């Protein structure tokens, strides 16, 4: 699965835990 561009932003802002599809840091 390709890494969604949003997931990148999410990780940076640390809103990963906020975005289900981008459950990053």
PDB file of C-alpha atoms in Angstrom:
ATOM      1  CA  UNK A   1       0.000   0.000   0.000  1.00  0.00           C
ATOM      2  CA  UNK A   2       1.404   3.427  -1.015  1.00  0.00           C
ATOM      3  CA  UNK A   3       2.003   5.928   1.789  1.00  0.00           C
ATOM      4  CA  UNK A   4      -0.709   8.615   1.599  1.00  0.00           C
ATOM      5  CA  UNK A   5       0.670  12.159   1.370  1.00  0.00           C
ATOM      6  CA  UNK A   6      -1.621  13.095   4.261  1.00  0.00           C
ATOM      7  CA  UNK A   7      -0.030  10.472   6.497  1.00  0.00           C
ATOM      8  CA  UNK A   8       3.239  12.323   6.001  1.00  0.00           C
ATOM      9  CA  UNK A   9       1.717  15.585   7.178  1.00  0.00           C
ATOM     10  CA  UNK A  10      -0.023  13.745  10.000  1.00  0.00           C
ATOM     11  CA  UNK A  11       3.258  12.247  11.218  1.00  0.00           C
ATOM     12  CA  UNK A  12       4.956  15.654  11.190  1.00  0.00           C
ATOM     13  CA  UNK A  13       2.179  17.390  13.120  1.00  0.00           C
ATOM     14  CA  UNK A  14       1.915  14.323  15.293  1.00  0.00           C
ATOM     15  CA  UNK A  15      -1.751  14.065  14.504  1.00  0.00           C
ATOM     16  CA  UNK A  16      -1.154  10.493  13.501  1.00  0.00           C
ATOM     17  CA  UNK A  17      -3.081   9.178  16.483  1.00  0.00           C
ATOM     18  CA  UNK A  18      -5.877  11.540  15.461  1.00  0.00           C
ATOM     19  CA  UNK A  19      -6.131  10.265  11.874  1.00  0.00           C
ATOM     20  CA  UNK A  20      -7.289   6.584  11.836  1.00  0.00           C
ATOM     21  CA  UNK A  21      -6.003   5.964   8.304  1.00  0.00           C
ATOM     22  CA  UNK A  22      -2.752   7.695   9.257  1.00  0.00           C
ATOM     23  CA  UNK A  23      -2.297   6.224  12.756  1.00  0.00           C
ATOM     24  CA  UNK A  24       1.197   7.642  12.954  1.00  0.00           C
ATOM     25  CA  UNK A  25       3.007   9.299  15.852  1.00  0.00           C
TER      26      UNK A  25
END
